[PDB]
Amino acid sequence: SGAIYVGNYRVVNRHLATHNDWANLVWEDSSRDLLVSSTTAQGCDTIARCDCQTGVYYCSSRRKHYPVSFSKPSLIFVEASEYYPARYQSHLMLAVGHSEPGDCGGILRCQHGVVGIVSTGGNGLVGFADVRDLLWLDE
Numbered sequence: 422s423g424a425i426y427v428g429n430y431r432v433v434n435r436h437l438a439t440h441n442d443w444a445n446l447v448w449e450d451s452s453r454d455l456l457v458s459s460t461t462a463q464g465c466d467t468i469a470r471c472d473c474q475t476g477v478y479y480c481s482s483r484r485k486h487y488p489v490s491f492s493k494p495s496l497i498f499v500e501a502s503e504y505y506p507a508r509y510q511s512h513l514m515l516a517v518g519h520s521e522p523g524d525c526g527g528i529l530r531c532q533h534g535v536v537g538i539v540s541t542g543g544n545g546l547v548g549f550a551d552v553r554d555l556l557w558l559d560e
């Protein structure tokens with residue numbers, strides 16, 4: 422579990438969105454596993470607007486932060502699950518690192534701010550759903 426709170430927006434994994442998220446829906450994309458809902462309180466997170474390929478992510482299954490090198494956002498095949506059929510997920514970045522089911526929602530950050538959230542993982546890999554191209558999160 423985990424979310425990005427920026428301005429009047431809350432960014433979460435689409436497969437983990439609540440009834441409230443859907444009732445206050447701004448935008449959602451199954452192909453990216455992202456959902457953005459509206460909030461009344463103001464959000465304190467800063468979003469990075471960069472092309473960094475290094476950063477630090479929070480891993481709840483280890484209660485620790487880990488430094489990672491990660492790939493550029495791309496279309497990567499993701500196995501079937503209770504949430505989705507087998508498909509290509511877009512804007513996804515992979516890194517060599519630990520992750521387990523339950524780690525989705527962990528934030529990835531570089532020196533510029535929030536880069537994305539854990540969305541996939543397994544086999545010593547961890548996948549992050551990028552949010553740097555969503556320029557409208559700030560305005």
Ligand SMILES: NC(=O)[C@H]1CCCN(C(=O)[C@H]2CCOc3ccc(Cl)cc32)C1
Nearest residue numbers: 454502520521522524525540541542543
């Ligand atoms: N379609 C997706 O983005 C997700 C939906 C939930 C399920 N997905 C995963 O990748 C699961 C499958 C099992 O192994 C792991 C290990 C670590 C992590 Cl962070 C996630 C998973 C795909």
Ligand SMILES: [Zn+2]
Nearest residue numbers: 471473531533
């Ligand atoms: Zn950066």
